């Protein structure tokens, strides 16, 4: 394996790789890492772009993934992109695919001319019905994953994954500290515990020798760097390589 990697640059027709999203003030992270991967994956193995639906995830999915806007899990969620599939659906406001994004981008621990999040928000609808002059139907809009797998706390089995296969979703503890990250690469050193939180791993890399993964977060573009953080590699921090998933799309 080399000493960095950049999903980003090694797959130049895939611009999902390179797009972050915002889950809005609702605790859909789970839902966010998974579809953005899948849309990942779906592009790498069958290079067609589409934007999977973080919505049909995250209102469809059920108790298989666990609680909608309260969180879930990770696993489940690929599940049910093999299970269910998923349609297509962009960004807030975008009218783009399916079903697009329907809880408001905000601003997550920094200030801007969005209004701020609050983390109260509630579950939007399962609707199995596409936005209005979008074609196929909602059943023939589904993209389906052929599998749905975990990888092992083990730093090489990790980005030999993601290497060969795209980027996968992971999750890690994030203290206080975290919210103010703005660049380098992050360790935790301060803050009380904040909850769980699934993001999307793309690549990794060594930055004055300190070694690190490559994270997209859901917070938009003006959290952290430029939306992505690079977190500490290699020894498990905050759990960031204890709850690694995956899947492979359909032929
Ligand atoms: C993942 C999650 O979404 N976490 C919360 C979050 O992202 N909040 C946004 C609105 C923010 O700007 O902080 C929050 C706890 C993180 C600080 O609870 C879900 C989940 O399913 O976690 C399990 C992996």
Redesign the pocket.
């Known amino acids: 394996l080399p000493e960095s990697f950049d999903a980003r640059e090694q797959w130049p027709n895939c611009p999902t790789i390179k797009e972050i999203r915002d889950?809005g003030?609702?605790?859909?992270?789970?839902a966010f890492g998974a579809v953005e991967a899948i849309s990942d994956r779906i592009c790498i193995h069958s290079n067609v772009n589409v934007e999977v639906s973080a919505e049909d995830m995250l209102t469809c999915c059920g108790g298989e993934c666990?609680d909608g806007c309260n969180?879930?899990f990770?696993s489940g969620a690929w599940n049910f992109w093999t299970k269910k599939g998923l349609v297509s659906g962009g960004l807030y406001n975008s009218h783009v695919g399916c079903r697009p994004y329907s809880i408001p981008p905000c601003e997550?621990?920094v200030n801007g001319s969005r209004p701020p999040?609050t983390?109260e928000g509630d579950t939007p609808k399962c609707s199995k019905t596409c936005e209005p002059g979008y074609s196929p139907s909602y059943k023939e809009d589904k993209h389906f994953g052929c599998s749905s797998y975990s990888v092992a706390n083990n730093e090489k089995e990790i980005m030999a994954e993601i290497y060969k296969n795209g980027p996968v979703e992971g999750?890690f503890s994030?203290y206080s500290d975290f919210l103010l990250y703005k660049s380098g690469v992050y360790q935790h050193v301060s803050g009380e515990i904040?909850?769980?939180?699934?993001i999307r791993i793309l690549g990794w890399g060594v930055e004055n020798g300190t070694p690190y993964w490559l994270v997209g977060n859901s917070?938009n573009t003006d959290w952290g760097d430029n939306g992505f953080f690079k977190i500490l590699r290699g020894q498990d921090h905050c759990g960031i390589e204890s709850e690694i998933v995956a899947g492979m799309p359909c032929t």
């Open positions: 889950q003030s609702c605790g859909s992270c789970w666990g969180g879930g990770p997550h621990h999040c983390g999750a994030v904040m909850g769980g939180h699934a917070w």
